[PDB]
């Protein structure tokens, strides 16, 4: 069922995952459509910042070997120190906003391993499987 | 065991400021602006709650400075009135004897430089005594000439407030609470979101708020700090209070070619119903609404206190009286006729005397000034009073309140409190039972 | 054989598909290479609009799980109401311009299922294949 | 007595003695995603289909 | 071991390949964060040129069926005329700068086959494997 932009924002993370694309589209949006003038360089600046805003994180997903995004798995195990809750305590009983409230503390820390571990090791390995 | 799983398109956001841009339909300053959608979208968000804070909402700051920028840009390509700064030879104007009008204008004459830079021309024009001042018939001076230069507003451009919509760029969301209750800040049980804001007219006024939005339920009292009388109070009405203001002067525009090339619009002759401009207010309506306001006040000060209303502390006319624009003309009205009452412990119509100025200073800004051209013919208009800008004045019962203003960011804030801007963060991660194979 | 930019424009859709890359390169092009001045913000605006113009649709191909574009298959069946012709009546006897002339009527309609169906279902499913 | 005709209409500016007015060949280009189409048909009514594009 | 931006620049191509991502991140960088004014359109221009600079080559990697970049293989054989050295003479005894010094001569030439051969043939083929 089509809910609308951010229509699942007020639901559990499990439920919300159903309709990530409805949001995804408008993360970059597009369209929009005497010189200078007020707004003359503001629509300019804003529309630029939108593009940068998008790609800055998209590239990270490019690095984190997935690309086929919205959702993908890794080979990095979850450290229990990063909010030790059960799946039903998390996915079936918590919104994404509530999630960030806690996990945001380890953002860069988790990014470390995502930015690396697998990306490093998945490769070489393959290069070696190509030996024969 | 659980693993790190990567998610994208996550419905989360952080409070953040970015560069907003306008939209409005397809006069004032708006043309270079993206047309609005024929179907503005929205969506109520169920289970979503969070805090608002109108007192730190930087949307106001941007809007304020943007409007200022627009103002200047609309004047640069217009005619400068630099050579008007000359000694004026002025005399009283014999209005219908004896003297009810008090003159208020002088039949000034002066040697003016014309298109023929060389031979000058003795001309005349009617000026308000609020615009000119005696030097040292008698000699007079345009008041602006002691502070800065003055520019004539183009006769083609208008000042009619036009509904403007604000939009955020992709990655940013416009959040809008629909909660009829709001203290000025805190959590809202009922939050929605929109593509863009509703049309807001850039109405400049002091003391009284005009042509704004209406409140639901009861009268709304909002203040950064009610107990702190160094702050002020925003009052939003529930029902439009009609005010009808008139300038009964079918006057002409003896335009004078003080070139070269560029033309000046002087004041011709004043004929017709020589009465002072004034405003008409429905008295019973005012009394009724004021009472509703006092009810609120009772609710934040006690069920055994006394409420008195009075005029300002005086001083700068711009703050002392109610200033507003109608059709290009600038009015200054004595709101003592409104703000003069009291309430205990637990037609009819009102006439408000007004004055007309032609030299004005916007947004408390010094260093420049703008000359309003006289508008030909009788000028009369009507608007909706939709709120008050009040200030809080042996402190155990009787309290006195009075009208203020000055800082016009207050006006924008009186509307934008319904909105806030947040930055979406699409990228998130979470623990999920999944080990990824090659 | 190198034909040139849009060199196959005047051929059947089957034939044209041979050299889609020759076109692809110049869809974004690149290169190009007293203040303000006329052209001062026009080359600016234009070059920006090129970038947006490109990515706006590229993201759609990102959503429509392919990425390795120019051509890819889906798991959405073709509805016969969308111009019922045979393959030889289409691919061996029609240009791309002629194709759009008809199919353009159902553009957003088809996009609906492309934007969704598979993208929704392909996933979850996988998540379930990862159970063991 | 005579008058410069412009003074009854507007101000007038002297063109710099250095700048010229010689017409220079200008080429126009479209940004990526847009194409410049050019018919080579020697015949043309001002509008309609061109056999040779 | 984290070296830093271009930290492996002064090493053999084999060694340098270890930490390509450390460089990759800052190839586009991001962040950064009276009208006009000097710098007013310079930060503008520069930040734009960064985006273009990036994507211009990224698209090529999009065309060259890899996407999962930093490293990927092809089905194009190496022509011996393109600097005939042994692997130990190349990978274990040469920096990337030294490499370009020579191979730069055949840049566009190699791009020809990369831009094409495989991209052309890998496909069609698949279309044919989809017959059943
Ligand atoms: C709170 O909100 C309210 C509601 O919005 C505001 O109230 C409005 O205030 C504005 C002024 O700010 C009023 O605008 C005036 O409208 C006049 C009426 O025009 C209509 O009737 C005439 C007469 O038959 C028709 O000809 C018109 O039709 C045409 O115009 C419309 C719109 O462009 C077109 O769509 C049509 O196709 C027609 O072409 C209207 O139906 C209007 O006459 C008046 O315009 C004169 O005055 C302005 C300056 O104010 C001049 O720029 C302009 O040139 C006009 O002057 C000519 O006509 C007069 C007539 O006597 C002559 O004296 C002049 O010499 C000259 O020839 C103006 O636009 C509006 O009426 C009013 N609305 C309501 C609901 O009452 C409040 O302003 C606002 N409060 C505050 C604080 O601002
Ligand atoms: C908004 O939050 C409310 C809770 O505050 C969520 O309410 C849940 O709504 C659904 C739909 O009405 C209920 O689900 C139905 O429950 C019955 C019985 O359990 C079951 O038979 C149905 O198959 C269905 O699941 C759910 O019980 C109800 N929860 C509670 C606490 O009453 C609603 O889901 C929230 N919306 C968002 C987007 O998260
Ligand atoms: C511009 O208007 C001013 C008045 O606002 C005119 O001023 C007049 O200027 C002349 C020249 O300075 C004065 O004339 C001289 O007066 C003395 C004494 O009366 C006399 O001795 C001289 O022979 C001579 O006439 C004149 O008095 C002065 N008027 C006043 C009111 O001070 C000026 O003439 C005007 N210019 C134009 C073009 O009309
Ligand atoms: C305001 O001052 C102006 C001068 O700055 C006075 O102008 C005078 O206005 C009257 C009425 O338009 C003119 O009178 C008429 O003049 C013609 C020709 O002389 C005569 O045929 C008529 O019988 C009539 O008198 C007068 O000439 C004009 N003066 C000048 C200098 O142009 C106006 O009177 C002043 N108003 C006040 C209340 O004093
Ligand atoms: C709302 O603003 C008002 C004033 O802007 C704040 O009032 C201030 O409240 C404190 C606590 O009652 C007063 O501080 C006390 O003052 C006495 C004498 O100066 C001193 O002896 C104490 O050590 C203490 O500082 C303060 O004077 C009073 N200010 C005024 C203008 O009366 C109130 O705190 C504000 N509320 C919010 C939430 O910030
Ligand atoms: C432009 O349209 C013309 C038709 O108006 C297309 O003509 C086709 O051109 C090819 C090459 O000359 C012909 O193919 C050859 O045909 C012979 C016999 O069928 C076969 O032995 C060869 O192996 C080869 O296929 C084709 O028959 C001819 N079609 C007709 C109607 O004469 C041309 O392909 C069009 N170009 C574009 C880019 O689509
Ligand atoms: C910078 O260039 C220098 C050469 O000018 C490179 O020196 C190499 O440094 C490493 C680390 O000190 C040496 O590796 C060690 O060698 C010993 C014996 O072969 C081996 O037991 C260790 O396991 C280790 O490989 C290496 O021998 C040394 N090379 C020479 C010529 O002395 C250094 O690697 C260069 N850095 C960059 C980033 O390329
Ligand atoms: C999970 O990460 C935490 C840090 O977030 C690691 O914590 C370390 O735990 C050991 C054992 O208690 C201590 O010696 C370290 O001092 C802790 N570090 C800090 C920052 O407090 C823990 O090692 C991590 N687990 C995994 C498997 O890497
Ligand atoms: C113009 O009329 C005003 C009254 O409308 C006169 O005002 C007088 O001005 C002098 C000087 O300021 C004062 O001494 C008087 O008390 C003022 N009268 C009043 C009623 O306030 C002024 O004299 C008049 N000028 C002319 C030339 O007669
Ligand atoms: C600029 O002129 C204004 C009047 O146009 C002068 O303002 C006066 O300022 C003093 C000091 O604040 C007040 O006593 C007067 O009442 C003001 N007059 C009015 C009309 O408000 C100011 O003094 C002038 N400056 C110069 C340098 O002379
Ligand atoms: C906005 O409402 C909040 C409550 O929702 C008010 O918060 C009170 O603030 C004062 C000053 O910090 C504290 O003494 C109270 O204890 C707070 N109440 C609670 C519930 O925490 C705040 O006063 C309100 N603002 C307006 C203008 O009325
Ligand atoms: C004054 O505000 C009232 C709202 O209280 C406005 O009322 C609208 O009036 C018109 C004419 O009767 C109706 O078409 C609308 O439906 C009324 N609105 C509602 C809420 O009832 C009136 O437009 C306002 N006047 C000004 C000038 O804006
Ligand atoms: C002031 O007194 C009035 C009654 O005269 C009180 O009114 C109550 O207000 C609350 C909030 O609106 C309602 O829940 C009650 O039902 C009202 N009572 C009645 C009689 O209507 C109000 O509480 C009083 N304020 C003070 C501070 O005590
Ligand atoms: C304030 O308004 C009151 C009425 O609300 C005015 O009261 C008048 O006061 C004078 C002096 O006591 C009496 O002559 C009138 O009869 C009073 N009117 C009534 C209705 O009682 C008072 O004039 C007002 N003040 C201002 C400055 O206008
Ligand atoms: C193919 O799409 C068409 C619409 O483009 C669908 O048409 C419906 O067909 C049924 C049967 O004739 C009618 O009941 C509907 O009213 C038609 N819809 C409209 C818009 O006319 C058809 O259902 C589609 N087929 C598939 C398998 O989904
Ligand atoms: C501005 O000056 C021009 C001449 O420079 C005037 O033009 C005359 O206009 C009338 C009316 O169109 C014609 O009868 C004349 O033949 C025009 N003269 C020429 C030279 O073409 C115009 O009248 C002047 N305007 C002002 C206000 O005097
Ligand atoms: C490798 O590329 C070279 C060109 O870089 C090719 O060189 C051709 O070699 C043959 C045999 O010596 C000559 O007939 C040609 O004239 C050479 N071309 C030029 C440009 O000199 C060689 O053919 C290529 N090998 C592969 C397998 O394609
Ligand atoms: C994990 O959930 C189980 C029930 O599924 C519960 O017994 C345990 O308490 C939970 N974890 C925490 C930290 O309590
Ligand atoms: C489909 O083509 C066949 C021949 O291959 C033909 O018999 C049939 O008529 C074609 N479809 C249409 C709608 O006619
Ligand atoms: C290739 O390296 C081998 C040793 O591994 C050497 O014998 C031969 O000379 C090398 N190639 C060149 C062109 O010399």
Short mmCIF file of C-alpha atoms in Angstrom, two decimals, chain A residues 3-7 9-10 20 23 26-29 32 37-39 42-43 45-46 50 53-54 61 64-66 69-78 82 87 90-91 96-97 99-100 110-111 114 118, chain B residues 2-13 18-22 29-30 32-34 43 45-48 66 69-70 73 169-171 173 193 423-427 429-436 438:
data_model
loop_
_atom_site.label_atom_id
_atom_site.label_comp_id
_atom_site.label_asym_id
_atom_site.label_seq_id
_atom_site.Cartn_x
_atom_site.Cartn_y
_atom_site.Cartn_z
CA UNK A 3 1.62 5.49 2.18
CA UNK A 4 3.46 8.56 0.97
CA UNK A 5 6.76 10.29 1.65
CA UNK A 6 7.91 9.21 5.13
CA UNK A 7 4.55 7.48 5.54
CA UNK A 9 8.16 7.03 9.78
CA UNK A 10 5.88 6.31 12.73
CA UNK A 20 12.14 2.46 1.88
CA UNK A 23 11.42 7.73 0.67
CA UNK A 26 12.70 12.13 -2.84
CA UNK A 27 16.06 12.04 -1.10
CA UNK A 28 17.29 13.62 -4.33
CA UNK A 29 13.89 14.44 -5.76
CA UNK A 32 12.20 21.52 -9.31
CA UNK A 37 18.24 38.79 -7.74
CA UNK A 38 17.27 37.18 -4.44
CA UNK A 39 16.71 33.48 -4.98
CA UNK A 42 19.87 30.53 -3.51
CA UNK A 43 17.93 28.09 -5.69
CA UNK A 45 23.14 26.90 -3.97
CA UNK A 46 20.34 24.75 -2.55
CA UNK A 50 21.11 18.53 -2.61
CA UNK A 53 24.30 15.83 0.11
CA UNK A 54 23.14 12.76 -1.80
CA UNK A 61 27.55 2.58 -0.19
CA UNK A 64 30.75 -0.76 1.11
CA UNK A 65 30.42 -3.43 -1.52
CA UNK A 66 26.67 -3.34 -2.04
CA UNK A 69 21.20 -0.59 -1.72
CA UNK A 70 18.30 0.08 0.61
CA UNK A 71 19.45 -3.18 2.21
CA UNK A 72 22.45 -5.51 2.02
CA UNK A 73 24.41 -7.80 4.34
CA UNK A 74 28.08 -7.72 5.32
CA UNK A 75 30.67 -10.05 6.83
CA UNK A 76 31.17 -7.85 9.90
CA UNK A 77 29.86 -9.31 13.18
CA UNK A 78 27.91 -7.07 15.57
CA UNK A 82 26.71 -1.55 20.67
CA UNK A 87 15.77 -8.73 17.83
CA UNK A 90 14.83 -4.00 18.49
CA UNK A 91 13.06 -4.74 15.19
CA UNK A 96 14.34 4.14 13.43
CA UNK A 97 14.47 7.45 15.31
CA UNK A 99 17.30 3.35 17.18
CA UNK A 100 19.57 6.24 16.22
CA UNK A 110 31.03 0.96 13.02
CA UNK A 111 31.84 2.80 9.79
CA UNK A 114 32.25 -1.17 7.08
CA UNK A 118 35.31 -7.04 4.06
CA UNK B 2 24.05 -10.93 14.83
CA UNK B 3 25.91 -9.08 12.09
CA UNK B 4 26.19 -5.51 10.81
CA UNK B 5 23.54 -4.93 8.14
CA UNK B 6 23.47 -1.77 6.05
CA UNK B 7 20.23 0.10 5.36
CA UNK B 8 19.41 3.07 3.12
CA UNK B 9 16.34 5.28 2.91
CA UNK B 10 15.93 5.31 6.68
CA UNK B 11 13.17 7.68 7.86
CA UNK B 12 15.27 9.71 10.30
CA UNK B 13 16.43 13.32 10.54
CA UNK B 18 19.82 25.14 5.15
CA UNK B 19 19.13 27.64 2.38
CA UNK B 20 15.39 27.84 1.69
CA UNK B 21 13.92 29.13 -1.57
CA UNK B 22 10.56 30.59 -2.57
CA UNK B 29 9.41 41.95 -5.79
CA UNK B 30 8.38 38.45 -6.84
CA UNK B 32 11.99 35.39 -10.26
CA UNK B 33 10.44 32.55 -8.30
CA UNK B 34 9.43 28.97 -9.07
CA UNK B 43 0.89 13.62 5.19
CA UNK B 45 2.53 11.25 10.35
CA UNK B 46 0.84 8.89 13.15
CA UNK B 47 3.02 7.97 16.16
CA UNK B 48 5.49 10.70 15.20
CA UNK B 66 15.71 38.03 2.11
CA UNK B 69 17.45 42.27 0.02
CA UNK B 70 14.41 42.30 -2.26
CA UNK B 73 17.03 45.52 -5.35
CA UNK B 169 15.97 21.29 -1.12
CA UNK B 170 16.07 17.50 -1.48
CA UNK B 171 17.31 15.80 1.67
CA UNK B 173 11.92 18.10 5.05
CA UNK B 193 4.79 17.07 6.93
CA UNK B 423 17.97 17.18 7.51
CA UNK B 424 17.28 13.58 6.50
CA UNK B 425 20.02 10.99 6.97
CA UNK B 426 19.26 8.11 4.54
CA UNK B 427 22.11 5.91 5.77
CA UNK B 429 22.83 0.30 10.14
CA UNK B 430 21.35 -2.35 12.44
CA UNK B 431 22.02 -5.82 13.85
CA UNK B 432 20.52 -8.62 11.80
CA UNK B 433 20.92 -12.39 11.79
CA UNK B 434 22.82 -12.67 8.44
CA UNK B 435 26.22 -13.95 7.32
CA UNK B 436 26.95 -12.77 3.64
CA UNK B 438 30.58 -15.23 -2.11
#
